[PDB]
Design an enzyme around this catalytic site. Structure first.
Site, PDB file in Angstrom:
ATOM      1  N   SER A 123       2.498  -1.404   1.624  1.00  0.00           N
ATOM      2  CA  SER A 123       1.793  -0.081   1.539  1.00  0.00           C
ATOM      3  C   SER A 123       2.206   0.836   2.937  1.00  0.00           C
ATOM      4  CB  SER A 123       0.232  -0.439   1.676  1.00  0.00           C
ATOM      5  OG  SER A 123       0.156  -1.270   2.728  1.00  0.00           O
ATOM      6  N   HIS A 144       1.515  -2.516  -5.573  1.00  0.00           N
ATOM      7  CA  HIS A 144       0.815  -2.673  -4.426  1.00  0.00           C
ATOM      8  C   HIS A 144      -0.630  -3.462  -4.943  1.00  0.00           C
ATOM      9  CE1 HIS A 144      -1.290  -2.114  -0.736  1.00  0.00           C
ATOM     10  NE2 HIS A 144      -2.011  -1.371  -1.206  1.00  0.00           N
ATOM     11  N   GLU A 156      -2.215  -0.576  -7.536  1.00  0.00           N
ATOM     12  CA  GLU A 156      -1.433   0.613  -7.491  1.00  0.00           C
ATOM     13  C   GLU A 156      -0.125   0.228  -7.698  1.00  0.00           C
ATOM     14  OE1 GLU A 156      -2.417   1.581  -3.137  1.00  0.00           O
ATOM     15  OE2 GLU A 156      -3.844   3.143  -3.755  1.00  0.00           O
ATOM     16  N   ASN A 194      -5.160   3.866   0.828  1.00  0.00           N
ATOM     17  CA  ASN A 194      -5.081   4.076   2.351  1.00  0.00           C
ATOM     18  C   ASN A 194      -4.923   5.379   2.710  1.00  0.00           C
ATOM     19  OD1 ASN A 194      -4.593   1.380   2.923  1.00  0.00           O
ATOM     20  ND2 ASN A 194      -2.325   1.171   2.830  1.00  0.00           N
TER      21      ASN A 194
END
Lengths: 287, 285
Positions: A123, A144, A156, A194
């Site tokens: 990430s 992810h 993700e 994030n």
């Protein structure tokens, strides 16, 4: 149909979490790490978690068969080239160090099948940067996962500028087959979760540095007013202050025009003291 | 409390009656005030139902409901409502002229040492209080909806709020069962100040073409444990509200890049698609 055998490189927390859910979903898994001791700790923990989880899911025998059958689908290997030679899907889950990930992909591609799909779990970096050395980038993408992998439903799935639709569609399909709820994102810094939570934590830190409200008031306000499971400073301690610091430092330098990206004197001071959050038992709070 | 025994509340919307309810339940006397009798009768009925429901000993409980409701009187004129009030909470529509008119009326009629507060989340306390003679007795009590169920109270001081006024407000907030947090008159206090720009960051992500709207929502629910995703949450606050707030911030801090307006949000608001209240926004309801 297309993926039956998965190799996973990295036997730390996320790598073995991925191997756990991949194996539980019926795929064959090859778990590779040159650190033989981490490899052993990981196999033990998978076994303990799968046994533990089996309890909630038929009869006693029926639980214990599931356990044995699941573990039977996980093999190990101490050599990356050997471990990936015959995999359909390869998942790198090594620490966030870009040169190490590149080194590892260089070794994977010397040994893997031509039509095999390669993924990273990162990430912290852009797919484009992780994939920079690859010969075929149409087969590279991002998976992810979220720790603890056997518990978190979210995944993700990320396409670089080169991922083919074929590769992407297979990734989305693999995610779903391993029990995940997938969401699609492009190669953009921080993807969805994030890219949104980290600047939000940085905004809370800024609010505190202005003196507008106290640290524990902020945390309480977000928990009680927004119904978040953690307040932003706790969330930071939980992600790690060294991670949040490194990710923000990266964005600041890479997107120089983005005022929202900026370092925080308070985060830097804690990291400079080695108070890195939960993982060192001390960050914004102690543990 | 020693000091606060009578509380008047002006506005019988959702927030005002929630306040009246937790205030009466905590043992204060409440006067609830609104010129519109329909709104008031509706509020009084919601409160008694909410109190009955939450009460669920079979007399002991009936008695709580009765005693609780006996501590709420109603009133159709601001000036009568505040005549004996130690604390006055203004909980009207987010319209600054309207708020200021109510404070011009309180000020003509309230006791010399009573405390004045607004529940607003849309305006600076410096603006709401601009016409007042004694700004030292003025502050913010920002509750969260539905008030009987939400624990958080943002207790706000302006530049002029006296130390004594602020201490009474925190003490009052705690007495009506809330967890108080302390803020200054900085835009958005604590919650809106963090949430509203996070929602705009999401709309900007989406407007950039990086991910879809429902994926962004599902990501934050499942990845961050938020009860609602940013788009959903915008629809629940109302998009005209988040637009208006962010517009005011942008105008005041034109150098703060985080406050830039979103075309997407402007479009929906231009069309009257305001989220949950017009049954349309980012999603249909």
């Amino acid at each position: 149909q297309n993926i039956r055998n998965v190799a996973i490189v990295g036997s730390g927390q996320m790598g073995s979490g991925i191997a756990q859910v991949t194996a539980s979903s019926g795929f064959n898994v090859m778990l590779a790490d040159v650190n033989k001791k981490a490899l052993d700790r990981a196999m033990k923990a998978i076994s303990q978690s799968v046994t533990h989880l089996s309890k909630k899911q038929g009869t006693d025998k029926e639980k214990s068969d599931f356990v044995t059958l699941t573990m039977s689908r996980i093999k190990t290997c101490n050599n990356v080239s050997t471990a990936v030679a015959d995999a359909d899907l390869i998942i790198e889950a090594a620490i966030e160090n870009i040169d190490l990930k590149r080194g590892i992909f260089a070794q994977i591609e010397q040994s893997c099948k031509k039509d095999s799909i390669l993924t990273t779990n990162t990430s912290s970096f852009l797919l484009e940067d992780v994939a920079k050395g690859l010969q075929d980038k149409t087969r590279f993408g991002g998976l992810h996962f979220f720790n603890p992998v056997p518990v978190m439903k979210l995944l993700e799935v990320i396409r670089s500028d080169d991922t083919s639709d074929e590769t992407y569609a297979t990734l989305i399909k693999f995610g779903t087959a391993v029990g995940k709820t997938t969401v699609a994102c492009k190669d953009s810094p921080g993807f969805i979760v994030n890219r949104l939570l980290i600047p939000y934590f940085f905004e809370a830190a800024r609010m505190y540095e202005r003196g507008d409200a106290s640290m524990t008031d902020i945390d309480e306000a977000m928990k009680l007013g927004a119904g978040h499971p953690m307040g932003p400073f706790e969330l930071a301690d939980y992600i790690g202050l060294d991670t949040v610091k490194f990710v923000m430092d990266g964005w600041a330098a890479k997107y120089p025009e983005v005022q929202l990206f900026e370092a925080s004197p308070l985060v830097d001071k804690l990291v400079a003291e080695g108070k890195l959050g939960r993982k060192t038992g001390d960050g914004f709070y102690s543990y």
